[PDB]
């Protein structure tokens, strides 16, 4: 929106976009902070 922003979507494995994958409750969680444009949605 108005900053680097941080990806926090959940996954079943560490995504190449979020090398820092957090497997919790069985799924994953991105903890990255970057925004070359603003948001992918």
């Amino acid at each position: 929106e108005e900053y680097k922003c941080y990806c926090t979507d959940t996954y079943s494995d560490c995504p190449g976009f979020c090398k820092t994958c957090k497997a919790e409750f069985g799924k994953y969680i991105c903890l990255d902070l970057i925004s070359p444009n603003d948001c992918v949605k």
């Binding site: 929106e1 108005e2 900053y3 922003c5 941080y6 990806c7 926090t8 979507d9 959940t10 996954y11 995504p15 976009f17 979020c18 991105c30 990255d32 970057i34 925004s35 603003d38 948001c39 992918v40 949605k41």
Partner: peptide, 11 residues
């Protein structure tokens, strides 16, 4: 190609 769930509430 960040994730579809980008969080950026409050600059």
């Amino acid at each position: 190609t960040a994730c579809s769930e980008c969080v950026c509430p409050l600059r």
